[PDB]
Write an enzyme that holds these catalytic residues in place. Sequence first.
Site, PDB file in Angstrom:
ATOM      1  N   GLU A 773      39.042 104.943  75.621  1.00  0.00           N
ATOM      2  CA  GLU A 773      39.453 104.580  74.386  1.00  0.00           C
ATOM      3  C   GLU A 773      39.652 106.067  73.456  1.00  0.00           C
ATOM      4  O   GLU A 773      40.458 106.193  72.682  1.00  0.00           O
ATOM      5  CB  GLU A 773      38.989 103.535  73.688  1.00  0.00           C
ATOM      6  CG  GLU A 773      39.270 103.185  72.396  1.00  0.00           C
ATOM      7  CD  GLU A 773      39.028 101.926  71.732  1.00  0.00           C
ATOM      8  OE1 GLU A 773      38.339 101.084  72.420  1.00  0.00           O
ATOM      9  OE2 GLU A 773      39.188 101.525  70.629  1.00  0.00           O
ATOM     10  N   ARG A 851      31.656  94.245  64.865  1.00  0.00           N
ATOM     11  CA  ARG A 851      31.801  93.149  65.794  1.00  0.00           C
ATOM     12  C   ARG A 851      30.806  92.239  66.267  1.00  0.00           C
ATOM     13  O   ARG A 851      30.660  91.181  66.442  1.00  0.00           O
ATOM     14  CB  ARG A 851      32.616  93.520  66.963  1.00  0.00           C
ATOM     15  CG  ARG A 851      33.054  92.447  67.952  1.00  0.00           C
ATOM     16  CD  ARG A 851      34.050  92.868  69.051  1.00  0.00           C
ATOM     17  NE  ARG A 851      35.423  93.127  68.762  1.00  0.00           N
ATOM     18  CZ  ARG A 851      36.306  91.983  68.436  1.00  0.00           C
ATOM     19  NH1 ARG A 851      35.941  90.699  68.686  1.00  0.00           N
ATOM     20  NH2 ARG A 851      37.375  92.223  67.959  1.00  0.00           N
ATOM     21  N   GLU A1232      37.889  90.816  77.585  1.00  0.00           N
ATOM     22  CA  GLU A1232      36.634  91.122  77.114  1.00  0.00           C
ATOM     23  C   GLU A1232      35.902  89.682  76.984  1.00  0.00           C
ATOM     24  O   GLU A1232      34.518  89.760  77.219  1.00  0.00           O
ATOM     25  CB  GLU A1232      36.503  91.738  75.745  1.00  0.00           C
ATOM     26  CG  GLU A1232      37.001  93.111  75.596  1.00  0.00           C
ATOM     27  CD  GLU A1232      37.128  93.729  74.279  1.00  0.00           C
ATOM     28  OE1 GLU A1232      37.970  93.326  73.604  1.00  0.00           O
ATOM     29  OE2 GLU A1232      36.320  94.630  73.906  1.00  0.00           O
TER      30      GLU A1232
HETATM   31  O1  URC Z   1      37.712  94.918  67.735  1.00  0.00           O
HETATM   32  C1  URC Z   1      37.740  95.994  68.436  1.00  0.00           C
HETATM   33  N1  URC Z   1      38.246  97.176  68.153  1.00  0.00           N
HETATM   34  C2  URC Z   1      38.281  98.098  69.214  1.00  0.00           C
HETATM   35  O2  URC Z   1      38.664  99.520  68.942  1.00  0.00           O
HETATM   36  C3  URC Z   1      37.973  97.928  70.676  1.00  0.00           C
HETATM   37  N2  URC Z   1      37.778  98.375  71.642  1.00  0.00           N
HETATM   38  C4  URC Z   1      37.439  97.645  72.715  1.00  0.00           C
HETATM   39  O3  URC Z   1      37.075  97.905  73.903  1.00  0.00           O
HETATM   40  N3  URC Z   1      37.324  96.302  72.076  1.00  0.00           N
HETATM   41  C5  URC Z   1      37.563  96.389  70.702  1.00  0.00           C
HETATM   42  N4  URC Z   1      37.464  95.626  69.850  1.00  0.00           N
END
Ligand code: URC
Lengths: 1287, 49
Positions: A773, A851, A1232
């Site tokens: 990412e 989170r 996820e």
């Molecule tokens: O709320 C999230 N943002 C992210 O940038 C991201 N990246 C990820 O793998 N899960 C999530 N969840």
Amino acid sequence: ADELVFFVNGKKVVEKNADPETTLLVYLRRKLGLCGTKLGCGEGGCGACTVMISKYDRLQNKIVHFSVNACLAPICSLHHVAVTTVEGIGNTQKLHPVQERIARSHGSQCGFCTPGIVMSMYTLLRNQPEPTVEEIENAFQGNLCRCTGYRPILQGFRTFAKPSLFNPEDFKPLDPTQEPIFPPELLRLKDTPQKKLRFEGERVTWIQASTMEELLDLKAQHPDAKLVVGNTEIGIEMKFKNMLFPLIVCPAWIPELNSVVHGPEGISFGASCPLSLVESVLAEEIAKLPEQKTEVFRGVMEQLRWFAGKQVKSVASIGGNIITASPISDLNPVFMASGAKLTLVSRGTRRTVRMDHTFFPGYRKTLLRPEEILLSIEIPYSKEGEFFSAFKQASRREDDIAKVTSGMRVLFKPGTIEVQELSLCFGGMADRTISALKTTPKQLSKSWNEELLQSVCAGLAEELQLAPDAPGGMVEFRRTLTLSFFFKFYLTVLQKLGRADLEDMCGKLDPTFASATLLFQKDPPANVQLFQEVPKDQSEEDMVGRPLPHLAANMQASGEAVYCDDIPRYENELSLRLVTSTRAHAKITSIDTSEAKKVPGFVCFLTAEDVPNSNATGLFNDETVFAKDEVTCVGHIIGAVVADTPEHAQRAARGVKITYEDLPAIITIQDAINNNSFYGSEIKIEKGDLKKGFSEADNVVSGELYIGGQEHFYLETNCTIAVPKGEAGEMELFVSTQNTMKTQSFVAKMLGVPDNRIVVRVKRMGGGFGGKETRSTVVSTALALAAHKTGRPVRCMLDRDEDMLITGGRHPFLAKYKVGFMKTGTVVALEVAHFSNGGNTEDLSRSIMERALFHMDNAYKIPNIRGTGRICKTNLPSNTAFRGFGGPQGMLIAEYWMSEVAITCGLPAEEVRRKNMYKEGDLTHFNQKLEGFTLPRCWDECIASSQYLARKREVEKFNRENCWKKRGLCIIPTKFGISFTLPFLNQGGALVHVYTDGSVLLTHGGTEMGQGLHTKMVQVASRALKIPTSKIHISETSTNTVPNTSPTAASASADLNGQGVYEACQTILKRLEPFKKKKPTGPWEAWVMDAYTSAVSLSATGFYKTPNLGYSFETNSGNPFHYFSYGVACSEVEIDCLTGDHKNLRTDIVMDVGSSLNPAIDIGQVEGAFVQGLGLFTMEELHYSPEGSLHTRGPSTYKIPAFGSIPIEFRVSLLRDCPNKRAIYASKAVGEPPLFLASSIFFAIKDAIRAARAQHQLFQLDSPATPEKIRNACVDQFTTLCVTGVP
Amino acid sequence: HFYLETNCTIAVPKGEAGEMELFVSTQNTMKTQSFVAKMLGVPDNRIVV
Ligand SMILES: O=c1[nH]c(=O)c2[nH]c(=O)[nH]c2[nH]1
Ligand SMILES: Cc1cc2nc3c(=O)[nH]c(=O)nc-3n(C[C@H](O)[C@H](O)[C@H](O)COP(=O)(O)OP(=O)(O)OC[C@H]3O[C@@H](n4cnc5c(N)ncnc54)[C@H](O)[C@@H]3O)c2cc1C
Ligand code: FES
Ligand code: FES
């Protein structure tokens, strides 16, 4: 001679200048261009490079077939063999049955492991056309898959042995006569004598010795000559410890080193015999001889079960294991315990010795003279009254390194239970294989009874000491295993004395102890996949909600699917190697490139000075492209070597000498707390009145929990190719990344050119999982710079050790909790303080903590609640997104204190969870309303289908009837918020073209990393346009087709891109409407051609933003999430209280994925996510030195789930009749949310431990619950003697 | 015409689903794509010019 001659896929290869350092994997990929065979690790642990070898075996006189790791096979060992790769067995025009079945059974997700697994299965079939289920599982001990959770692979392949997701009746049958001919030239050449060969490379001379005389003469004149047989140790020494042996001799051809002779005392094996041959010989002997004679043979076999996999055992030699003399050899303890007889030879000499402690005098030394070789080893028949056990405990059963390993032997005086001889030998307890030579003498003439048990344990505890500082740590666990293994042997021998009719002299075994002595066996798997059929009336061309296989599955199985490094090199392309800090925190005092410059092909060493515009990079602009003045972690990138080849770049990188001056380092979360070293301020969510809740509470429990981090272990590492265009700053990059936009931005900022000059292209990744990412850009920026500077294409793929060190992982978490609750189990108050270790840049750390706080409730309504989080800033690699993004850590803490509530109240855990659960319409602690709350349905369905209550009864009975094994059972719910925590990232775009033949080219912002995103988008477009999926194609993802894209992350990519695609399709349909009206039946192709010749545009963009999002921490208001995912898992385990090992007996999952877009892909995501969770909570552990240096840098030490890891009974149901009207075609995101459900296994383990502790109180179980942590928590007579003492 | 650059094509096969990318000195990308796709018997959507 000097030409190397072999065959590849039936084609003759003649190599006139073979270099002994060249591996088969490099030769296939770089010299022959066959890129189906992949690099996953370079250390034999992943099987991604598996290929098949065929040869005419002169000794057995027949064509043989076996599998090898191409990453460790020197081409110089391959003269006159025939190699078969994935390309050699089939292709998409004619798939081999193996390729067809793995593809059609949904056995291929990212696809990067698929070729290797194909070749493992293919080799099995060439050897055994009708294998057993067990043989099939055993074929893959050496193959890893990170995506699938293994289930579908074994299920598809089960069809070879002895509504639906796939239809095995449509599988084409196997015709073995249609396999490739063994090359007739090779059969002709089996009638000519082998001659000695010599190959000379840049640094290494290789001699392939043909006779014993040549070998002895060589070792006489040149004792420095390094023997290589399998190369499975030497290859590691050379690749990973920078050892260079300039003269190598390979004796594999010599008949005397390959012989098996049956003698009076035993069976003698030539020292070059592969372990596969030792196995097949000993298996036949064990099957045909009396049990009384095969005790030692069975010991060896038991060790070889857990020795690597098929690929390593095909070429690893028995003599190579012996002479390697590793402290953790699994065989040398068995050979020492059984006094195996070794014959040693040199020119004009021959001596025989019995292996005993003298054979191993020092770290990795034997008593061989430098000019001596090992000729043979005789493994002995056992005698009457002689019993043997062998033991190995590691982190994982399959393909792992021993923590402790052992051979144990007792001989009784005939007709007695009195000890004549006793030998206990151990690996992993010293710098060599040792005998407990002080303890065992003292038991001679004693009877096999409780006093011997107690005397031997006290002796072992004193004799096998470990320093606090011993390499690998886990000193308490390792000591405990030595005693525990001896206990098992003690009990086993009691049983064996029993069966020799001497039960009267030694006790009978208490029947609650019998399970202690059982040899491991799992049981055949039983799997169930349940999903909902689409409506009767749905068009057969509407594939939405149907189980369509991944669009690239066939190409992945055939090795035709192209990953970054499979792209052919330009003739002028250069290689880049990163040079990283070996200090956690230090000043760079100087850099010396003098040795680097002397490596052939060296081009330049790039540093901060070479950056054209800005050295400031990273999501929060707090990272260097390249270190300037100071390094802030071990792994901090200082510069990049550019050379012609990756070999030369590696060698040159080693000649970059850095001098440092250390600065105070902050490593641990405690270090960071003590130094006030954090990323920003405390984050907090609080609701209700904590003071009041705790005062109202009948009970209050406080504690802490530590959660270890996690390496993504995408099978394809980080990779970038940067292609400079020579005009206007233009550059195109081919990258394995989930984030084209940030890759583009970061390259452009570093170069100081506008974004419009930079194009980033992603066809697919071999996995990402959050690891790509942001952290991909640290490679991309470096390569872009090299390309810009040279004006030449440049490429870099990280080696696994580099990737694991540089790119970081999941955040370790430390939490401190206090929970208030009523005697009924109702929770009234909760305060949790979270700390994460973020490492040396902010990256996504703060969003991850948010989170975690958003999920600190898990599924539970808590009226008075306060959570805080702090992100620690440390001198470690920067941690980043990993599938779950703080959710799993948050929710594991919640379940952990929830477990202690149930225990404290003495109520059944499931009743306590259920009565604390939210209901429909409740507000979360962050004031979001739970609508369409399906969790109670998931729960009730799971409870019922798993027969949880009756299974509780079976677990209780097992635990009352077994002292040394225990079962546990737990059911865990989850709630997972869907949408990026940063609101504006909830957007996506698409672009669609319809060409005048009617065919449709679609692209969107999402990237394919194995999750089947392109498949789903095609399903979506096909419904939206009302045309077959066959007419629609997605080729790649690019910044120059869809700009400003969010990362493929947050499980949201099908939601966002689905809408984008849908809208783009609606625009096309609107334009075709008048043509439809005039020709209502005439086909799609006629409407298209009519629109075109009417000058109507057949191109459209599409876009979507998720509406109504935006939470405020200041006001605890606004919706962070568009909706929530829900699911429940029930898991059962059986632990080994003496070793820490456990079996995952059964898991049942019910998951709400709304109206699934594709149930095959969604079940695959559930299973894959669940198994990554299983790794997080029970197997995967990273270790660091006190100075912040990552020790854990490959699959040898980092143990992800294996084929053998998964729940034996594995049931997955997608919830029926639960449309989610606010995502595309009523689906929900899936990537996820299932991962945390593997906590069911963690809590089932915790349950079993509690039973074990009652056998032999809110005890601590940190994550991961590894064999170390499980074993250490099972306190007993043995752990007591090992922690301090009192004998 | 005597364009100083003569006619020139590089065709790069991608090895997947008949996908091919062509670098061409042409005034007519559309007909180039059509004609290649028809000759090979693959859809226009596989062929990039
Ligand atoms: O709320 C999230 N943002 C992210 O940038 C991201 N990246 C990820 O793998 N899960 C999530 N969840
Ligand atoms: C993925 C993986 C998993 C593994 N798992 C295990 C495991 O579970 N347990 C375990 O014990 N090991 C394990 N190993 C280690 C390795 O496979 C064994 O030590 C193997 O037996 C080495 O044999 P080889 O023929 O490949 O040796 P090579 O690497 O070719 O040589 C090893 C050493 O022996 C010497 N040598 C070889 N033959 C002779 C001879 N006749 N006389 C004198 N010297 C000789 C060489 O000079 C060298 O020093 C593993 C290795 C890998 C890569
Ligand atoms: S690349 Fe060869 S085993 Fe991993
Ligand atoms: S599909 Fe096996 S590693 Fe990705």
